[PDB]
Design an enzyme around this catalytic site. Structure first.
Site, PDB file in Angstrom:
ATOM      1  N   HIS A  13       0.776  -1.232   0.000  1.00 56.23           N
ATOM      2  CA  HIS A  13       0.000   0.000   0.000  1.00 56.23           C
ATOM      3  C   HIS A  13       0.813   1.290   0.000  1.00 56.23           C
ATOM      4  CE1 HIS A  13      -3.949  -1.888   0.401  1.00 56.23           C
ATOM      5  NE2 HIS A  13      -3.554  -2.586   1.445  1.00 56.23           N
TER       6      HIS A  13
ATOM      7  N   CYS B  79      -0.382  -1.213  -4.716  1.00 54.82           N
ATOM      8  CA  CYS B  79      -1.771  -1.780  -4.891  1.00 54.82           C
ATOM      9  C   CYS B  79      -2.719  -1.011  -5.813  1.00 54.82           C
ATOM     10  CB  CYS B  79      -2.443  -1.815  -3.541  1.00 54.82           C
ATOM     11  SG  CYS B  79      -1.565  -2.945  -2.499  1.00 54.82           S
TER      12      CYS B  79
ATOM     13  N   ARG C  50      -1.035   1.871 -11.165  1.00 51.19           N
ATOM     14  CA  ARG C  50      -0.022   1.302 -10.274  1.00 51.19           C
ATOM     15  C   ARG C  50       1.306   1.872 -10.630  1.00 51.19           C
ATOM     16  NH1 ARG C  50      -1.597  -5.052  -9.694  1.00 51.19           N
ATOM     17  NH2 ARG C  50      -3.174  -4.602  -8.048  1.00 51.19           N
TER      18      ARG C  50
END
Length: 150
Positions: A56, A125, A128
């Protein structure tokens, strides 16, 4: 590797001396709350192929918040408890669409690699960001930390 469990620790000097994140098996939503996730269909750490890891940017500890700072030549270092693996970034950060699954194949078309090697990929995530790296060196944990982490 056991699904959902940590198997390695990642260090990236560019993201800070104290940046240190566990890498867990799998890339399901529950795994990624706890740390970085290894795509379980990809190579194991250090192996021929492409060891691919997601993380993340803006939630759950924001491990990849400063991903755009990564440069060619920056080191990505992992320990599995036995060996220190030093990878060096060759390509990226590259922006792409989430549908571009090719980026984690064993020899990704967009990496620039034109042959089998021992690669690593980092993925954030609704685009991208990707970097690709190759294995530069290994040394035993019993021998001390690698150059890059002193």
């Amino acid at each position: 590797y056991t699904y959902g469990k940590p198997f390695a620790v990642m260090y990236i000097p560019r993201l800070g001396f104290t940046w240190n994140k566990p890498v867990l098996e799998g890339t399901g939503t529950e795994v990624l709350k706890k740390g970085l996730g290894h795509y379980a269909n990809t190579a194991r750490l250090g192996q021929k192929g492409n060891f691919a890891v997601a993380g993340h940017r803006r939630t759950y500890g924001d491990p990849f918040k400063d991903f755009p700072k990564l440069r060619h030549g920056d080191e990505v270092v992992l320990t599995d408890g036995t060996t220190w693996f030093t990878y060096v970034i060759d390509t990226g950060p590259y922006k792409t669409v989430p549908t571009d699954v090719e980026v984690i194949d064993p020899v990704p078309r967009k990496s620039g690699y034109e042959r089998e090697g021992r690669y690593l990929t980092l993925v954030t995530c609704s685009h991208r960001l990707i970097v690709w790296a190759h294995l530069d060196s290994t040394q035993p944990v019993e021998a001390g930390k690698p150059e890059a982490l002193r």
